[PDB]
Design a protein around this ligand. Sequence first.
Ligand code: NA
Length: 305
Amino acid sequence: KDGFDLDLTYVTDHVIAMSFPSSNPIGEVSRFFKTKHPDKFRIYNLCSERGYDETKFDNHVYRVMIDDHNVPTLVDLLKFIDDAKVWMTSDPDHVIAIHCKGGKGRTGTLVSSWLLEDGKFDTAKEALEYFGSRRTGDVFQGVETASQIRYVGYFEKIKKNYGGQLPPMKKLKVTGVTITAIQGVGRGNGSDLSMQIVSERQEVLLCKFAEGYNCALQYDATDDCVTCEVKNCPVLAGDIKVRFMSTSKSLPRGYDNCPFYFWFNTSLVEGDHVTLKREEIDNPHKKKTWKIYRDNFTVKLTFSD
Ligand code: NA
């Protein structure tokens, strides 16, 4: 419209999703907002990797450092909701524009959460699906990774069960991992696998199954599964990312430079373990990998503390 040719979408009348303003060239994204929404916009940059001259948007850019194919911290997500809320409710004409690189996975994570906050939807599934329709009914059009779906759900849970405020802190130690449908995955018995636990951007534990480096591996051919005792785990708090690596050539890497990974938040765990199915693990959630990760592929972390 009106001389503009932009990868930009009105998710609602006052919520916009878009691509990175590059040098979508930044000058025309700059014009667009100065023309269509003068003095009434706030840009959210969701890329940890890239920034720009924010003066082109009159310094109205707010940054969320999110890694490509990952999730914001819950703290960060909640802060974004607060910032957007204040801006949105201040003036009925105020508009928010949210972006990552593709205006896809990270973007969809905050937009669907914003849609929850704003009461347009009751459930994360509905919001995600709605964002998916506007951006392109499937939850995976909305965001890119299973952890991104989980974090929208986390926000749903916070809003519904914790009055929009952070839950009470729990801390955990990982004591065990079980992986089911191990056959056809890497070497098929877990010998090629290692697990890295990441908290606050740092490695906090590395386990190598074959060598028994911080672990003890057990392979059960009858049950087609691996159980691994995890040792030396530090106390874990907040948003934990668990990454699985392979030394095996037949196990390809998806996003995050590994075969498969996932995020969870310690306080939003229930009881004693978390079990993820195939469509809830990052990378195996993609149909292209389903002859490797079969439909009873599963990852379970066992906790204490
Ligand atoms: Na404590």
